[PDB]
Amino acid sequence: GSSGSSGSGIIKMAIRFDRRAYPPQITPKMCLLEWCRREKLPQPVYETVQRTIDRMFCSVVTVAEQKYQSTLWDKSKKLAEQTAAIVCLRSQGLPEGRLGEESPSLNKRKREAPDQDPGGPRSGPSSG
């Protein structure tokens, strides 16, 4: 059973891509896909946007109709992409994180956005 995600919709978690965590011959993004093959799951979708407050880059992966965004941006867009994967794996509970899942860090920032009502894509041609 689930542990208890904090947030209705997108599972947000504190994670920061750590190069030292993985060798130059292995990437956290490849580990995810390799996992989607066994679970007959459809390839994920990476999406990196640029904010205006900190002009920082942040990627967001989506698997099994579940989005995984990190609460920690990245200096570059390329790096942000790495985080995504990790976040996904951790959420699924794969061993593709133990490497550096935990780490001594005093970072805590919960971003909040105003919303009167939910939305999303256009599930079906008719209301749903």
Domain of residue 8 covers: 1-101
Closest to 11 measured CA to CA, from 62, 59, 65, 69: 69
Spell out the residues 6+ positions from residue 52 whose beta carbon is closer than 8 angstroms to its own: none
Q: For position 70, which CATH number holds?
A: 3.30.160.20
Q: How many folded domains does the chain comprise?
A: 1
DSSP secondary structure of 75-128:
SSHHHHHHHHHHHHHHHHT-SSSTTTS--------------SS---S--SSS--
Residue 58 within any structural domain of the chain: yes
User: What is the experimental method?
Assistant: NMR
